[PDB]
Design a binder for this molecule. Structure first.
Ligand SMILES: [Cl-]
Length: 129
């Protein structure tokens, strides 16, 4: 599923991401835009052989099991394919664990490089929330 901008914002808000650990909703929508272009089916392979999955590009090196990243962890306790669902519940619940781990949203490279320190409220402007 390729989300619309406001559609995703409303889904994220419903799942408790707005101001989660101090990160306003705009931060999450911006991250998803630049990580996956709002596409739940996005995958990208990393140099180390791990793979990033889904709308928030969660990495199989630490967070999910894909059966092909030897010596990796599965901290969210889910198969990586669960992160590709049109239902964002699994991605959100795992993201909540990631952002709580001490490094905040800096875990997401595209957030650090393209959202951090910008006017992120622009990403939810005009949305019925
Ligand atoms: Cl933080």
């Amino acid at each position: 599923k390729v989300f619309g901008r406001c559609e995703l914002a409303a889904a994220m808000k419903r799942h408790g991401l707005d101001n989660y650990r101090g990160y306003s909703l705009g931060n999450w929508v911006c991250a998803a835009k630049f990580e996956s272009n709002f596409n739940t089916q996005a995958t990208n392979r990393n140099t180390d052989g791990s793979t990033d999955y889904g709308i928030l590009q969660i990495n199989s090196r630490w967070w999910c099991n894909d059966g092909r990243t030897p010596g990796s962890r599965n901290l969210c306790n889910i198969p990586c394919s669960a992160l590709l669902s049109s239902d964002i519940t699994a991605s959100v619940n795992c993201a909540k664990k990631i952002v709580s781990d001490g490094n905040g949203m800096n875990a997401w490279v595209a957030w650090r490089n393209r959202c951090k320190g910008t006017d992120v409220q622009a990403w939810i402007r005009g949305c019925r929330l």
